[PDB]
């Protein structure tokens, strides 16, 4: 791959647009059982946080040296309040609806002995109203970007997620998207969708070869009318489905720590260099490498232009 | 035959309980598990429901309020959301506030997070009150001790308790009875009490574990001596309660025939014998009535209350 200008970067506008959430950590003591059930009591003595979802995913664009737009729903609660805060510090451009109905979506994960042992998870869905301003915001902000990214987490951000790919593809603009679910219908016409094995496997099965895979995966680009296919494989690496054939980059991980957010690394990655006029095959190889990147490191942290390149 | 005399209504409104010690917030989470966590080999609970219950200290006095007497609660909360619920919950408790504000402190938080009617997990949120924060609570115990007729002690080892020997004395010295939830294994704090009220694992803590129940009788009439406690309440769970004084020993076995949640039990107790002590009711009754109440509010969901009209009827 040839290494990308930073000044060719900046002219790179991703808007991303889906589930956006709060990643909170409780890091506690464990000495005791519970008086009450079978289960251990944690005495939390530290709490973290940081940007999730459709957040973590624009952070990964600005990081790398990319301009990110974050249209995303958010409630009027303490996690929403936390988001808008953390987002005024980030880079990323927010765009947030306000439900004040909707719980902020949170992901609360609690630690004991560098071990986690649950996590809590608050969401639920925006209303209609809500999703209706939303989808007009997003008529404006269309013409103001380059690529779309679609980070679906099924918490309802992203319910007129058909409607939005017909207005990007009819107004030139690149369709990426980040699925969740198993119709996938709603993302006909995207220029790439990017699923893990656990996605993937939902709406074509599992694979009982290579071969197998390439057909499936074939077979459901011309049923979706989507151009390429990027299957990311964990410790396999990831593969690109296209017309112009398969690419297959393997994990370049030297240390795994923690995985959490990678997909969305993945992702952002490709958005931001497919605005920055990479090729999708380049991107795809820069993304790989970002993520075996971000892979050792705790939490769900970014990847930034100088540790990607040199 | 009667075992206790049913009391009156306007006897128990004019006992006065002071209670004193760690206040919390009983939070629960209820929610949903339908996956593993794709991070940990943990479940993950997308919580659907909130409850909050007053805690700690705090429920002692809603408990002296519903049987029919009246509470006052000084505690240290501290200056935050868990902090002004208390504070909200208060108000609707028929509990007399009487809070220490301490900015640097978490209010101590109970938070159980539940799943499919299982609990899976309690976090705990606590720190220590500072030592300026509790000498201006030590001054306020001062006004309130004219005021009420019993005190009583309700210590989690939270912090809240760091001068309990000098309000032991305060209160005794002013003829008030003393009557302590104990904590640690120190208890030499707790000197001078009235009555002490331990679990049975409080009390394994202090005197080490019993081999026979002359042996237990033996420990506990020697702990009372040396520590110069007029009565130990020891509460045994299932096998109920034993009361041990210089003028002999009590046993009452558990009553409860629906057991849904203990949890708070022995808040419960200490309640009652102390609102049944200021209300002029004899020691030994009170300790029935409070076995009475226990076995009732065990058969209750979470932290919850006996009123005087489940307890006499
Ligand atoms: N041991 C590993 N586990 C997971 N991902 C890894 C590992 N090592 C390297 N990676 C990279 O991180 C990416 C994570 O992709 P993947 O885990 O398949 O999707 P995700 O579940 O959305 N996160 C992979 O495509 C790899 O390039
Ligand atoms: N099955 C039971 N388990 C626990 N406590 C019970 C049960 N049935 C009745 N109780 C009553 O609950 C009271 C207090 O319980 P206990 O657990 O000993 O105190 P605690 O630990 O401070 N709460 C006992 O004295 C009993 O009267
Ligand atoms: O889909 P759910 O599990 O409900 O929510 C997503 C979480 O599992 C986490 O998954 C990650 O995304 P990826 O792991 O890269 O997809 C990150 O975006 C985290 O911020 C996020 O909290
Ligand atoms: O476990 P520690 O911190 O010592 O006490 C807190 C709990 O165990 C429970 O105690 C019970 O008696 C009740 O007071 C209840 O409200 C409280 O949550
Ligand atoms: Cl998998
Ligand atoms: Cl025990
Ligand atoms: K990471
Ligand atoms: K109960
Ligand atoms: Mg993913
Ligand atoms: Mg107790």
């Known amino acids: 791959v040839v290494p990308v200008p930073r000044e060719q970067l900046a002219r790179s506008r991703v ?6 959430m709060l990643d909170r950590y409780w890091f506690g003591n464990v000495d005791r059982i519970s008086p009450e059930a079978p289960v251990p009591v944690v005495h939390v003595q530290r709490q973290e946080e940081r940007l999730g979802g459709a957040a973590n ?3 990964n664009a600005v990081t790398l040296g990319g301009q990110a737009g974050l249209l995303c729903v958010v409630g009027c609660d303490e996690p929403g309040e936390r988001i808008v805060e953390l987002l005024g510090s980030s880079g990323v451009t927010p765009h947030l609806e306000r439900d004040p109905a909707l719980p902020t979506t949170i992901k609360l994960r609690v630690l004991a002995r560098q071990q986690q042992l649950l996590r809590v998870d608050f969401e639920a869905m925006p209303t209609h109203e809500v999703l209706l301003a939303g989808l007009a915001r997003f008529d404006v902000l269309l013409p103001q970007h380059d690529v779309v990214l679609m980070s679906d987490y099924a918490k309802g951000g992203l319910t007129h997620v058909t409607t939005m790919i017909e207005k990007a593809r009819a107004a030139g603009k690149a369709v990426l998207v980040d699925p969740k679910g198993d119709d996938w219908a709603r993302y006909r016409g995207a220029s790439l969708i990017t699923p893990n094995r656990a996605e993937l496997r939902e709406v074509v099965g599992q694979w009982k070869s290579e071969d197998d895979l390439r057909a499936r995966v074939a077979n459901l680009r011309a049923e979706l ?5 990027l299957l990311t494989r964990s410790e396999e690496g990831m ?12 994990a370049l991980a030297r240390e795994v720590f923690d995985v959490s957010g990678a997909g969305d690394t993945v992702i952002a990655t490709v958005a931001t260099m497919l605005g920055a006029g990479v090729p999708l095959v380049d991107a795809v190889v820069l993304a790989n490498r970002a993520a075996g990147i971000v892979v050792g490191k705790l939490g769900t942290a970014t990847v930034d232009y100088d540790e990607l390149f040199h």
Do not use: C, K, N, Q
Request: charged fraction near 20%.
């Open 225 to 229: 009318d989507i151009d390429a296919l």
């Open 15 to 20: 808007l991303v647009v889906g589930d956006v």
């Open 57 to 59: 995913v624009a952070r």
């Open 239 to 250: 593969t690109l489905f296209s017309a112009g054939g398969e690419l297959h980059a393997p």
